Amino acid sequence: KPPSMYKVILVNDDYTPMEFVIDVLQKFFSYDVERATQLMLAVAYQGKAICGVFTAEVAETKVAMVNKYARENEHPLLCTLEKA
Amino acid sequence: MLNQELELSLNMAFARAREHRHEFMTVEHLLLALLSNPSAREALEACSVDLVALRQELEAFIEQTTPVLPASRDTQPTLSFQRVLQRAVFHVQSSGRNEVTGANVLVAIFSEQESQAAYLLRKHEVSRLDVVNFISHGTRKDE
Ligand SMILES: [NH3+]CCC[NH2+]CCCC[NH2+]CCC[NH3+]
């Protein structure tokens, strides 16, 4: 019974600037500008988007870091994780 | 208070991660470094575990699953890592002992359910009880 892998997701809200989301994708998910831009767009269009798939351990830490950054920059950018 | 041997291991795992610009020093980094920790190695050998394979598995897992930092924020311990270490410190204190050993840390790893490290230990048929029996009571070898 190997540990399960987890999707790290960003959810859409009306108060976070698109610029900040791009900042997040670049700083925490190592995306270049172009890939980061289309992922933020998908988040705004579809309401949420999978930004990566990591091991449970990494995913857990990653989600806590991203939310901490958002909160420190006074934005409501909510990051979550889902199994499978 | 972490005997000097453990410090070396903890420093070793930490360097292992930085050396590869890993975004995180994980529980798996911890276990691999513990393989060279006498206190920890002894408990595992006493449990009849193929240390050659385990090292191969952990090293392969770390390379493929640990995110690398962009050439453009230092290495960070996973929350799982922090819990393991804090669990070992607490138990040693709460059981009335002065030093934390690699074996104590090894024990604490079994509590991280979703860690690859706990999984690999179970795969080599080593349970928490097996390590605990060896540490506390005689060189209670698996067999
Ligand atoms: N959650 C509370 C921790 C309690 N720890 C008790 C450790 C006691 C070890 N000696 C036990 C006596 C064995 N007969």
Short mmCIF file of C-alpha atoms and ligand atoms in Angstrom, two decimals:
data_model
loop_
_atom_site.label_atom_id
_atom_site.label_comp_id
_atom_site.label_asym_id
_atom_site.label_seq_id
_atom_site.Cartn_x
_atom_site.Cartn_y
_atom_site.Cartn_z
CA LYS A 1 0.00 0.00 0.00
CA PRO A 2 2.32 2.80 -1.28
CA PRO A 3 1.51 6.36 -0.16
CA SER A 4 -0.90 8.05 -2.54
CA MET A 5 0.11 10.94 -4.84
CA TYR A 6 -1.71 14.28 -4.47
CA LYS A 7 -2.98 17.03 -6.75
CA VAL A 8 -2.09 20.53 -5.58
CA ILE A 9 -4.85 22.95 -6.60
CA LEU A 10 -5.44 26.71 -6.77
CA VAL A 11 -8.97 28.04 -6.38
CA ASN A 12 -10.44 31.15 -7.97
CA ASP A 13 -11.55 34.19 -6.00
CA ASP A 14 -12.47 37.75 -6.94
CA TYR A 15 -9.88 39.64 -4.88
CA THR A 16 -6.50 38.08 -5.77
CA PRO A 17 -4.69 39.80 -8.67
CA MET A 18 -3.84 37.64 -11.69
CA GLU A 19 -0.33 39.01 -11.28
CA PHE A 20 -0.08 37.43 -7.85
CA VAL A 21 -1.27 34.00 -9.06
CA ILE A 22 1.43 34.09 -11.73
CA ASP A 23 3.91 35.01 -9.00
CA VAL A 24 2.83 31.90 -7.07
CA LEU A 25 3.06 29.49 -10.01
CA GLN A 26 6.55 30.77 -10.75
CA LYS A 27 7.90 30.90 -7.20
CA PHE A 28 6.43 27.62 -5.93
CA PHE A 29 5.78 25.50 -8.99
CA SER A 30 8.81 26.43 -11.14
CA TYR A 31 6.71 27.42 -14.12
CA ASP A 32 7.96 29.82 -16.76
CA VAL A 33 5.83 32.88 -17.58
CA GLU A 34 3.91 31.29 -20.47
CA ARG A 35 2.99 28.06 -18.70
CA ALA A 36 2.17 29.99 -15.55
CA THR A 37 -0.08 32.38 -17.44
CA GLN A 38 -2.20 29.65 -19.01
CA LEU A 39 -2.59 27.92 -15.65
CA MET A 40 -3.79 31.12 -13.94
CA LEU A 41 -6.18 31.60 -16.87
CA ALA A 42 -7.54 28.07 -16.43
CA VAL A 43 -8.03 28.86 -12.75
CA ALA A 44 -9.99 32.00 -13.56
CA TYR A 45 -11.94 30.35 -16.38
CA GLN A 46 -12.74 26.95 -14.86
CA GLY A 47 -12.82 28.12 -11.23
CA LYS A 48 -9.82 26.03 -10.20
CA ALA A 49 -6.91 24.16 -11.75
CA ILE A 50 -4.48 21.39 -10.91
CA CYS A 51 -1.06 23.00 -10.61
CA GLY A 52 0.93 19.87 -9.87
CA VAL A 53 1.07 16.27 -8.65
CA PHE A 54 3.39 15.44 -5.76
CA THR A 55 3.89 12.83 -3.05
CA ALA A 56 1.62 13.27 -0.03
CA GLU A 57 4.55 14.55 2.03
CA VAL A 58 5.67 17.18 -0.49
CA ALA A 59 2.10 18.18 -1.31
CA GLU A 60 1.28 18.79 2.32
CA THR A 61 4.26 21.10 2.80
CA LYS A 62 3.74 22.84 -0.52
CA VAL A 63 0.10 23.70 0.25
CA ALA A 64 1.06 25.16 3.65
CA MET A 65 3.77 27.29 2.08
CA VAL A 66 1.65 28.68 -0.72
CA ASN A 67 -1.20 29.65 1.61
CA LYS A 68 1.31 31.27 3.95
CA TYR A 69 2.69 33.41 1.13
CA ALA A 70 -0.79 34.47 0.05
CA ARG A 71 -1.74 35.35 3.61
CA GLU A 72 1.49 37.31 4.14
CA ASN A 73 0.74 39.33 1.01
CA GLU A 74 -2.81 39.94 2.26
CA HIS A 75 -4.50 37.94 -0.54
CA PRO A 76 -7.15 35.22 -0.14
CA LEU A 77 -5.53 32.88 -2.71
CA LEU A 78 -6.65 29.45 -1.45
CA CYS A 79 -4.51 26.43 -2.27
CA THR A 80 -5.71 22.88 -1.53
CA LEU A 81 -4.73 19.26 -2.14
CA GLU A 82 -6.72 16.28 -3.42
CA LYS A 83 -5.75 12.60 -3.49
CA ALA A 84 -5.39 10.34 -6.56
CA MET B 1 19.48 16.37 23.24
CA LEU B 2 20.52 14.47 20.12
CA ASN B 3 23.74 12.55 20.70
CA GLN B 4 26.62 13.68 18.48
CA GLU B 5 26.10 10.72 16.17
CA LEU B 6 22.55 11.85 15.35
CA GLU B 7 23.64 15.45 14.70
CA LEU B 8 26.04 14.13 12.07
CA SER B 9 23.22 12.20 10.40
CA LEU B 10 20.83 15.16 10.54
CA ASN B 11 23.56 17.35 9.07
CA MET B 12 24.31 14.71 6.47
CA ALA B 13 20.72 14.48 5.26
CA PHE B 14 20.47 18.25 5.17
CA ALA B 15 23.63 18.52 3.05
CA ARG B 16 22.43 15.73 0.80
CA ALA B 17 19.37 17.85 0.00
CA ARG B 18 21.21 21.16 -0.47
CA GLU B 19 23.81 19.47 -2.66
CA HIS B 20 21.05 18.63 -5.17
CA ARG B 21 19.30 21.97 -4.63
CA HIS B 22 16.28 20.00 -3.40
CA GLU B 23 13.34 22.18 -2.42
CA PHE B 24 12.76 19.89 0.58
CA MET B 25 14.74 17.74 2.99
CA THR B 26 12.26 14.88 3.44
CA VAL B 27 11.69 11.97 5.78
CA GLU B 28 13.24 9.77 3.08
CA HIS B 29 16.39 11.90 3.17
CA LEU B 30 16.31 11.33 6.91
CA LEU B 31 16.05 7.54 6.66
CA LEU B 32 18.80 7.20 4.04
CA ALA B 33 21.12 9.21 6.29
CA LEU B 34 20.08 6.99 9.21
CA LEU B 35 21.37 3.94 7.33
CA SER B 36 24.86 5.23 8.21
CA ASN B 37 23.81 6.03 11.77
CA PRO B 38 25.23 3.26 14.01
CA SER B 39 22.31 3.29 16.44
CA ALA B 40 19.88 3.17 13.50
CA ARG B 41 21.91 0.78 11.32
CA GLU B 42 22.23 -1.68 14.20
CA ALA B 43 18.46 -1.80 14.81
CA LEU B 44 17.82 -2.39 11.12
CA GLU B 45 20.55 -5.05 10.81
CA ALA B 46 19.02 -6.63 13.92
CA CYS B 47 15.74 -6.68 12.00
CA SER B 48 17.36 -8.42 9.01
CA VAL B 49 16.82 -5.73 6.39
CA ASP B 50 18.62 -5.65 3.05
CA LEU B 51 20.39 -2.31 3.46
CA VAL B 52 21.69 -2.51 -0.09
CA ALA B 53 18.17 -2.48 -1.57
CA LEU B 54 16.62 0.00 0.88
CA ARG B 55 19.35 2.50 0.03
CA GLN B 56 18.67 1.94 -3.67
CA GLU B 57 14.93 2.43 -3.19
CA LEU B 58 15.22 5.59 -1.07
CA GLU B 59 17.80 7.15 -3.38
CA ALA B 60 15.65 6.37 -6.43
CA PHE B 61 12.56 7.76 -4.72
CA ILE B 62 14.23 10.99 -3.64
CA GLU B 63 15.59 11.74 -7.11
CA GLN B 64 12.26 11.20 -8.85
CA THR B 65 9.89 12.86 -6.37
CA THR B 66 11.79 15.72 -4.78
CA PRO B 67 11.25 19.09 -6.58
CA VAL B 68 14.41 20.98 -7.51
CA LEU B 69 14.85 24.69 -6.81
CA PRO B 70 15.02 26.99 -9.87
CA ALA B 71 18.39 28.59 -10.71
CA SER B 72 16.50 31.78 -9.92
CA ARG B 73 14.84 30.37 -0.92
CA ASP B 74 16.92 27.56 0.61
CA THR B 75 16.22 23.86 1.23
CA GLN B 76 13.33 23.34 3.63
CA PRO B 77 12.29 20.47 5.96
CA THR B 78 8.92 18.92 5.15
CA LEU B 79 6.23 19.21 7.85
CA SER B 80 6.51 15.42 8.02
CA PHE B 81 10.21 15.72 8.76
CA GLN B 82 9.56 18.25 11.58
CA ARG B 83 6.98 15.98 13.20
CA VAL B 84 9.31 12.95 13.18
CA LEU B 85 12.12 14.84 14.88
CA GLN B 86 9.78 16.50 17.37
CA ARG B 87 8.20 13.12 18.14
CA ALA B 88 11.61 11.62 18.96
CA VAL B 89 12.60 14.54 21.18
CA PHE B 90 9.31 14.41 23.07
CA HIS B 91 9.34 10.66 23.71
CA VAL B 92 12.93 10.74 25.00
CA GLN B 93 12.03 13.59 27.35
CA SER B 94 8.76 11.97 28.39
CA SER B 95 10.44 8.63 29.04
CA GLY B 96 13.09 10.17 31.25
CA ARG B 97 16.22 9.88 29.08
CA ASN B 98 18.97 12.42 28.34
CA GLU B 99 19.82 11.78 24.69
CA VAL B 100 17.96 11.18 21.46
CA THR B 101 19.53 8.52 19.24
CA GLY B 102 19.13 7.57 15.59
CA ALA B 103 17.19 4.52 16.72
CA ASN B 104 14.70 6.77 18.53
CA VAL B 105 14.28 8.85 15.37
CA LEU B 106 13.94 5.66 13.35
CA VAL B 107 11.13 4.62 15.70
CA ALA B 108 9.35 7.94 15.20
CA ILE B 109 9.34 7.44 11.44
CA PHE B 110 6.66 4.73 11.69
CA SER B 111 4.19 7.43 12.81
CA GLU B 112 4.32 9.19 9.45
CA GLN B 113 1.67 7.01 7.80
CA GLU B 114 1.76 8.57 4.34
CA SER B 115 5.53 8.74 4.14
CA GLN B 116 7.35 6.64 1.57
CA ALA B 117 9.84 5.93 4.35
CA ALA B 118 7.26 4.20 6.57
CA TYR B 119 6.05 2.27 3.52
CA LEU B 120 9.53 1.04 2.53
CA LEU B 121 10.16 -0.13 6.10
CA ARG B 122 6.94 -2.14 6.09
CA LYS B 123 7.88 -3.57 2.67
CA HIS B 124 11.06 -4.98 4.20
CA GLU B 125 8.83 -6.44 6.91
CA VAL B 126 10.04 -4.19 9.75
CA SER B 127 7.32 -2.99 12.11
CA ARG B 128 7.58 -0.39 14.89
CA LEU B 129 7.41 -3.15 17.51
CA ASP B 130 10.38 -4.97 16.00
CA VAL B 131 12.59 -1.91 16.38
CA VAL B 132 11.21 -1.10 19.84
CA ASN B 133 11.85 -4.64 21.12
CA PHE B 134 15.43 -4.57 19.91
CA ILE B 135 16.13 -1.18 21.50
CA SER B 136 14.58 -1.76 24.92
CA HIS B 137 14.96 -5.50 25.47
CA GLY B 138 17.80 -7.76 24.44
CA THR B 139 19.34 -7.84 20.98
CA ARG B 140 15.92 -9.31 20.25
CA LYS B 141 16.76 -10.22 16.66
CA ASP B 142 13.83 -10.70 14.28
CA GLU B 143 15.15 -14.26 14.22
N1 LIG C 1 1.41 10.77 26.65
C1 LIG C 1 2.12 10.64 27.97
C2 LIG C 1 3.47 10.00 27.90
C3 LIG C 1 3.75 9.01 28.99
N2 LIG C 1 5.11 8.40 28.85
C4 LIG C 1 5.41 7.41 29.92
C5 LIG C 1 6.78 6.82 29.73
C6 LIG C 1 7.07 5.83 30.82
C7 LIG C 1 8.15 4.82 30.53
N3 LIG C 1 8.33 3.88 31.66
C8 LIG C 1 7.12 3.01 31.80
C9 LIG C 1 7.12 1.98 32.88
C10 LIG C 1 7.19 0.58 32.41
N4 LIG C 1 6.70 -0.42 33.42
#
